[PDB]
């Protein structure tokens, strides 16, 4: 399956940084160009690009992980973690199968995000229970992102 031509247009329009990756569990690939992200179903012969460009700074890592139980509506099948040089962003994902045999992907906002800090994020992994761990090329430290449904006066929705 060739990369769509529109992704080549964006990739060669890259000013500083680009990156490619796989969501093999659902038959999707992704490409980041600076602060912009593009997903597409690579099994589809002429895919449409799911664009997400809310991010303000360069994307350094992207991953698709399971959700934390009892947090999201049951129709949310995954969480999309987007790490930039300034913050990590969580997006709800619903990858429901289609008649053709390739998951239909729709994105949901969450208001869940945290400032990155001084440590680069180049690696994101998720556990069966939705725990999100982070690491990168600044040091050997391992961080974890917590998130919950309820907003509290003494604690944010995402830490």
């Amino acid at each position: 399956h060739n990369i769509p031509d529109k992704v080549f247009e964006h990739l060669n329009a890259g000013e500083v940084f680009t990156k490619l990756g796989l969501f093999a569990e659902i038959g999707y690939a992704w490409a980041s160009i600076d602060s912009s992200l593009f997903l597409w179903d690579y099994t589809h012969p002429n895919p449409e690009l799911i664009g997400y460009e809310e991010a303000t700074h360069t994307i350094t890592a992207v991953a698709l992980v399971p959700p934390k139980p009892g947090v999201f509506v049951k129709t949310i099948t995954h969480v999309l973690v987007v790490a930039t040089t300034s913050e990590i962003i969580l997006l709800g994902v619903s990858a429901t199968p289609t008649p053709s045999g390739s998951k239909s992907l729709t994105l949901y906002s969450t208001r869940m995000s945290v400032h990155r800090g001084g440590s680069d994020v180049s690696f994101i992994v998720g556990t069966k229970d939705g725990r999100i761990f982070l690491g990168g090329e600044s040091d050997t430290d391992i961080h974890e992102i917590f998130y919950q449904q309820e907003e509290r006066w003494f604690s944010s929705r995402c830490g």
């Binding site: 060739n2 031509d5 992704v7 080549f8 990739l11 000013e15 490619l20």
Partner: peptide, 16 residues
């Protein structure tokens, strides 16, 4: 698409 994406200055080489 393909043509435009490959030629796009704002797309990282890695992605192209």
């Amino acid at each position: 698409l393909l043509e435009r994406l490959v030629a796009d200055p704002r797309i990282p080489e890695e992605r192209k």
